[PDB]
Symmetry: D2
């Protein structure tokens, strides 16, 4: 959607389905080289890659459970081995995991939610950072980190979702620290967050352009530390 | 920057210079029909209009002081008479008026700041609304209102700018009400909130002050007017942002306080 | 409710009824000298003053419509003529005025809401400031400004209440400027803001202690620029 | 500071020193029965307990590292065994652990910060909740949970403190969920969020750094632990704050960024 995305090396965690996949398809159309990721390879992964290549981009799939640091390191290393560097990281791995009210929150549930939603983002960003910085140094422009937030990161998680909302609030805040200390490395950090004034739920296609906007130096070069909610007024 | 902006009728208040102008230019490059506005025509207005038309857009200039409701209604009426409707309203008119500490804020100054920055936005949006709604009904998509906020609307105005910051905070909030009651009219309301931008707005600042500010911004400099523009087009494009409403997007290089 | 409120000179705008009056009664119990205010004197004003004096404080009533600057100046002057200075200003004048949707917002309604809710606060604070500063200089402690906000100043006004919510948001912000530029004058600026998790609406008595807390240097001497919502989780 | 605190059973995690201790002292002066807590007893613990008892309150010390759920459950159980129930929980345990830039954040450090600051609050609140609810049911009023946030939870952690700031932001948010689902249990949840306070927390800072910070704070200095305490009592008192829940109160002398 932006001319300066052509050839950009874009790693998108949690892109085997949903918003992540929709976003990956848009980047490929823009001519980007896209790292697809999930815990397991989709059965139709070859078709998806073929389509992304037909659309004028490139794609490769990487399997990993990003709940551990070693998996985050391996994903980054595999992606760089394939495409030679990183221009854009999209942290979209994560999710609800399950729903448990406070009296039912044990260690196993806590660890599941916190590792899936926070450790994944912190460690993947950590390992991607030197690559993102090197890319920005080489181009004289900016590299981009975009993490997926939630409306719950603003006003709290729903039933059984206390930890999920708070985990997303964590991400909103840690990005502020990353802005303060890594703007000097040429990396911009922004967040997209996929009763309702619009009277309907949003689609995956409606969440995707915002990711490309935040990824494009042309579009958003002076924009960092932002949280863009896509919620039809919710 | 987005293909669905071609032919869109875009009224941009405060677009003679600076952010408003840079934004107008980008819209015309996208093929939009742009209403340019200021209190009086700038010396370069013919050149500006020519460039916008060469780009495949269109442009017409409208003079108004939007401090009164009558001027807001007349601007909207004149714009509709020229272009036939409204798809996008950008409320960018406003300004400091001056810098006065609290002890020096008399009615003249208070009224000047409040009318320039708040009444202008409320009344211009009011008069544009039926047109924006009709356009959305006709297209089956959405029309857009985008208002210019400020970093000051989050963390407070600087020296003598207490009313200016608070006026911008007013705009940030009133948009929430408009989302709640006019989303059903097919209108999306969003805010672009510039930080410190290298425009006439900050031309009074000494080199020492500019340097001080620049050193405190993570990106190490003031923004440019051109760095503000893409966000407006993004919010104006149903293709790009059709499920986005009631957002405030800060363009500040990491800066959150004056 | 706090021992250091004894003898404090407390001007409370919009205190002839409701939250303002309830707050005034608490200050008088704490031994404060209280300026009561409304557009018109209540029919039972003499009884109210007598009660406040019986409770160990003092009270006087001042009539004014604070929609104009001259009325704000006159109120401050009358209060200082009566009590000799100002330690605490509570800006509680204001209100909805009426309910009009955007297409019905004309100049007369706009002016009504904006003057009642914003001009009143800006001008009363302006005229009270030199007195507040002199009081803080003399005691070596702090003087206090407390303005009444609303939940609407955070999440927007309800039906026909767009301007009211936004006016309260204005107050939230202008206080930040006043913190930046008048903390040096020994004045603290805070806000109290009187579907619902608690399953009930709040009372005037439940809104009052927060005002005394923010007014007491002992309780809140390092606290400024705050907004305390009293809404049962709303 | 409030008459209804007399006899209240108040568990304060991280109360050996600093803010937690100053808060504990003020509660005991109000006649409360206070649970003091740290990883190990401070040298002055007998003196502290003596002073609190002389004031007409009571105090007992409980050792725990609240990084594990087991330790949180044991603390709550031991407190209830001593005092018979819980009226107020103050979650003040936490800390930096260390300062590490993002490249240096390994699992050991991450786990240490996250467990110390988040798991501690989640698990201690979980185990205290049935007691807090029973106390509120019995009194016909409310019990209170107050957690210590931070300025950093709003605007981000400083050098090497990215996880600490974000952990505090986590606490600010999770309280919203607890309000939504446990208000019906008669428990109010509020946060006291200190700015820069003159405690052991900042003892590592050079004079140059302390001076720099102090000059940027509107009130011109770090806060004291004693300046934090009244807010906790305010939030703990049903008399004072019975209709107040889900609030975050910053005590920062006008400072909003590190």
């Amino acid at each position: 959607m932006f001319p300066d995305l052509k050839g950009k090396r874009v790693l998108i965690t949690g892109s085997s389905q949903g918003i992540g996949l929709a976003t990956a398809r848009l980047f490929a159309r823009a001519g980007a080289k896209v790292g697809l990721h999930g815990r397991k390879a989709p059965a139709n992964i070859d078709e998806t890659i073929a389509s992304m290549r037909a659309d004028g981009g490139d794609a490769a799939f990487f399997a990993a459970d990003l709940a551990t640091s070693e998996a985050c390191q391996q994903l980054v290393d595999e992606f760089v081995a394939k495409f030679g560097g990183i221009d854009v990281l999209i942290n979209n791995a994560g999710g609800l995991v399950g729903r448990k009210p406070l009296p039912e929150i044990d260690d196993t549930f806590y660890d599941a939610v916190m590792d899936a939603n926070i450790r994944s983002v912190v460690m993947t960003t950590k390992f991607a950072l030197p690559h993102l910085a090197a890319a920005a140094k080489a181009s004289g422009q900016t590299s981009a980190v975009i993490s997926t937030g939630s409306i719950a990161g603003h006003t709290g998680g729903g039933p059984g979702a206390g930890l999920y909302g708070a985990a997303k609030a964590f991400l909103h805040n840690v990005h502020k620290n990353w802005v303060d200390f890594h703007t000097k490395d040429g990396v911009r950090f922004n967040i997209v967050s996929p009763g309702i004034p619009m009277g309907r739920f949003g689609t995956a296609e409606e969440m995707a352009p915002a990711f490309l906007f935040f990824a494009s130096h042309l579009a958003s070069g002076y924009i960092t530390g932002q949280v863009l909610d896509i919620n039809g007024g919710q």
